[PDB]
């Protein structure tokens, strides 16, 4: 849950090619003496320096859960009509289980 999407390696924009890359540029471009091309056309040379990415998805929905804020945790004297919160000490699970076990 660290929230670190980083690769953590020199692969984002390092451009780990050899010196042969300068010759590959002459393959991407069309030349024989490139000492005059970047002094004039710098936009195309900036276009030949761009990375290709791939995005990633994930989704989990939402947890709509109310009933929070439990500050006073000592006890709570029940209201006059206690048989509205009294039949909650044991839910319908341990109430239906004892009836199904009768067979």
């Amino acid at each position: 849950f660290r929230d670190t999407a980083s690769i953590g390696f020199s692969d984002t924009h390092q451009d780990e090619k050899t010196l042969r890359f300068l010759k590959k540029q002459i393959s991407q471009f069309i030349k024989h003496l490139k000492e005059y091309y970047p002094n004039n056309e710098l936009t195309k040379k900036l276009v030949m320096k761009y990375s290709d990415v791939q995005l990633l998805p994930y989704t989990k929905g939402a947890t709509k859960d109310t009933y929070t804020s439990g500050l006073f945790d000592h006890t709570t004297g029940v209201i006059k009509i206690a048989p509205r919160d009294g039949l909650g000490n044991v839910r319908d699970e341990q109430s239906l289980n004892k009836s199904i076990c009768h067979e």
Partner: protein
Amino acid sequence: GGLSQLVAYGAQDVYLTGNPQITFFKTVYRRYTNFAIESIQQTINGS
């Protein structure tokens, strides 16, 4: 015994027990979210 006190009821008790709101003898506890606590040791950097 205790019955002799219950019968000692008057106008004054209207501010204590008349028109009652609560009791003390049937506590209803709150249900709560499931959780657990673990004690874990941390790494201390430096010296």
